[PDB]
Each structure stands twice: as structure tokens, then as C-alpha cells.
Amino acid sequence: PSRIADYLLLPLAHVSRALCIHTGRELRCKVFPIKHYQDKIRPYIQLPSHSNITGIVEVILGETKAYVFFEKDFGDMHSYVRSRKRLREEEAARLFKQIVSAVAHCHQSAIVLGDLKLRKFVFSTEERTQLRLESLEDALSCPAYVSPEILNTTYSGKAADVWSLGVMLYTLLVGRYPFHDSDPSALFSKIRRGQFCIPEHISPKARCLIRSLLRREPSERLTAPEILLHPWFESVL
């Protein structure tokens, strides 16, 4: 029952529906206190573009509050791979590169994500060819995306994000997590011991990549920029 700037705000059922009063077209809007934006969200706005990595079209800063307007997504990547059992290497490589590129771009602007999951990547279009980051805090089935460093102890974080990328890469190709168990002690021991098995239908270049992203030792893992050069991508695309 409300409005700011170009947009009427309609409920759903902490985000809401934004309808542009000029064009008529529907976006989404999430309000924050201005200082939460300044701290936790303004870093993503500083990205060079920004509107491709995140879905954000414009933000409006008042005296008191920040209104972040973004384009609506067409479902997350966890629901996707779950819905498809697993992904063929051709599509998996397309989608993963976008994921890595977004992450690589963030790392270059000093942003460490920390909360990297398949959940965090959402389709920008109805065709579901193109992903963006879900930057705004909005059976397979932490844990699993959690790395040997944080259990043992400070650490990089950027390397920790590459671990998560490795878990994500394994998971879309394989269809389940690299580490999984009924007993959690066993789960965390297998994390800390870097202990997993790749299937044989997975191809040598693809296996090669997963291995180089999932290393106990953080320094020995690739960086997000390095990842994008790896031959797996070019072998299928």
C-alpha cells in the first residue's frame, strides 16, 4: 500500500514488488536501513557492472533508508540441479563459468562472499541460460560448502570461496555433495581430511579442475581468475 520514486510497492507472500509508474514493468525492491546498505551491500554496487553480476538496476538513498531495486529471478541453481538429477558437462561448464566470473569479479573489488552455495545463483532470464548472484540475502540435500581452514584455525576467505566453488562444481556435475554422511563427526573428519571420490563418467579435464579447487592446503588452490583459464571450459564450449 506504498510508493517511492518511480515505483509502487506491492506485497509478497522482506522483499516486495516494484511496479514502475512510467513503463508499468515489474521489478523487486528490498529496503534496508541506510547503514546496513553502506556496510554489507554498497560493496556490490561498486562493481564495474554490477547490474550483470547482481540483478540491481538502481538504488535510492534517502536521509534514513536505502531502497535497492533489482530484476526478478527465475529460480535458483540448487533447485535446478535437484530438478535435473545432474547436469551434462556442456551446460555445467556454461553455467559454472558465469558463477566463477561473478566470483572472480567480486574478488577483484575486494569482496569476499563467504556464503557461497548453489542456492546463491539465480537465473536472470526465462530461458534459464544466464545466472546472476543473489547478493541481497534472499535428497541432495554450511555444512558441505565448508572448508578445512575454518575448522582448524584466521584464513584468506578468497581461497575459502574457491573451495566452495569446487564443492559447487562437483555437485552440479555429480548430482550430490563431495562430502556427505549420516554421522557429522564423520562428515567433518572427511572435510578436514580432504577425502572424496569423483565418478568415472566425469571427464579428465573436469576431474582435473575439481581436484585443483578442492585442496586441504588453501594456498595450493586456484584463484577465481586462474579458474577461468582452465582447459575444461574450452574443451566443451
From Swiss-Prot:
Keyword entries, A-Z: Protein kinase inhibitor
GO molecular function, one term: ubiquitin-protein transferase regulator activity
Cellular component terms (Gene Ontology): cytoplasm; cytosol; nucleus
Domain Protein kinase: residue ranges: 4-233
An annotated GO BP: negative regulation of MAPK cascade
Tissue expression remark: Expressed in most human tissues with the highest levels in skeletal muscle, thyroid gland, pancreas, peripheral blood leukocytes, and bone marrow.
Subunit structure: Monomer. Interacts (via protein kinase domain) with CEBPA. Interacts with COP1.
Protein's job: Adapter protein involved in protein degradation by interacting with COP1 ubiquitin ligase. The COP1-binding motif is masked by autoinhibitory interactions with the protein kinase domain. Serves to alter COP1 substrate specificity by directing the activity of COP1 toward CEBPA. Binds selectively the recognition sequence of CEBPA. Regulates myeloid cell differentiation by altering the expression of CEBPA in a COP1-dependent manner. Controls macrophage, eosinophil and neutrophil differentiation via the COP1-binding domain.
UniProt remark on domains: The protein kinase active site is incompatible with ATP binding and is inactive. The C-terminus (351-372) is required for interaction with COP1.
Record family assignment: Belongs to the protein kinase superfamily. CAMK Ser/Thr protein kinase family. Tribbles subfamily.
Protein known as: Tribbles homolog 1
Origin species: Homo sapiens (Human)
Taxonomic lineage: Eukaryota, Metazoa, Chordata, Craniata, Vertebrata
Residues of the full protein shown: 88 to 342 of 372
